[PDB]
């Protein structure tokens, strides 16, 4: 199916504590594969997925020099934005960016993107056309004009359709055994007492991959997507994910509820009861 190459960049200033913290984390679909962290003597770009061992000295050297340049750019940006917003030189501030591209099953671009944020709020973004920008406030508008005059859009789209797409396909090739695998979920159900003669039924789904999955509780065919509680899908530390969903049902009426697990690794969906 479709695949994606995403880069999460963060630069946080810490007045009176030295230079800002800079971080770049790379993802190919749901698994982390690269990372740069300014906090470390000799900070370098490091592999985060096993298959990245197939890269070679050159790859790491270039990405590192590239990351250090970006680090300095955001260092300057933080100072620039204090001017745009008329802010104190002693308060902490954050800049974030999510850049990336998604390709179809055939490897051809489906979409590319780049969205910035200042202090947790939208700043500037590349529109789906990859030709224009959309600024969230008057500060971002100054950035938009600078980028329009410099022709940043063509440069970014050249990367999105070119470098981003080609390297994504390469990563998928080299890491096929891991990125193209399917780990089927293992479901479980737990029960916990409750005050007013009611019970909590929790449905667990463990060890799956990719991340996308659907968990539901039903009462005689009808989905109870209302009084149902749940957590967002979470990584489990070995490249797999987990999730849980629960409903509060009347004591002694438990056998009337069923948990449904839909996933790529499940030819036919799982149904559980307590």
């Amino acid at each position: 199916g479709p695949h994606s190459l995403r880069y999460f960049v963060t630069a946080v200033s810490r007045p009176g504590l030295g230079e800002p913290r800079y971080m770049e984390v790379g993802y190919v679909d749901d698994t982390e594969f690269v990372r740069f962290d300014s906090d470390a003597e000799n900070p370098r770009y490091e592999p985060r997925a096993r298959w990245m061992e197939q890269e070679g000295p050159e790859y790491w050297e270039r990405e590192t020099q590239k990351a250090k340049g970006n680090e300095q750019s955001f260092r300057v940006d933080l100072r620039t934005l204090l001017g745009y917003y008329n802010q104190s030189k002693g308060g902490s501030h954050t800049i974030q960016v999510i850049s990336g591209c998604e390709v179809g099953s055939d490897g051809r671009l489906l979409r590319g993107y780049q969205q910035y944020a200042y202090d947790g709020c939208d700043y500037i973004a590349l529109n789906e056309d990859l030709k224009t920008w959309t600024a969230a406030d008057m500060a971002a508008l100054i950035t938009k004009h600078k980028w329009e005059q410099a022709g940043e859009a063509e440069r970014l789209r050249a990367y999105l359709e070119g470098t981003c797409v080609e390297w994504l396909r390469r990563y998928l090739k080299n890491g096929n055994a891991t990125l193209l695998r399917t780990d089927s979920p293992k479901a479980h159900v737990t029960h916990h007492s409750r005050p007013e003669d009611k019970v909590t039924l929790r449905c667990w789904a463990l060890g799956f991959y990719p991340a996308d999955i659907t968990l539901t509780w039903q009462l005689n065919g009808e989905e109870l997507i209302q009084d149902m509680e749940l957590v967002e899908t979470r990584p489990a530390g070995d490249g797999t994910f987990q999730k849980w969903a629960s409903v509060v049902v009347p004591l002694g009426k438990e056998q009337y509820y069923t948990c449904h697990v839909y996933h790529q690794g499940l030819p036919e969906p799982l149904t559980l009861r307590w």
Binding site: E24, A67, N70, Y123, K146, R155
Partner: peptide, 8 residues
């Protein structure tokens, strides 16, 4: 491979 960002 990562992009080289341009200043804001």
């Amino acid at each position: 491979r990562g992009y080289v960002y341009m200043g804001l």
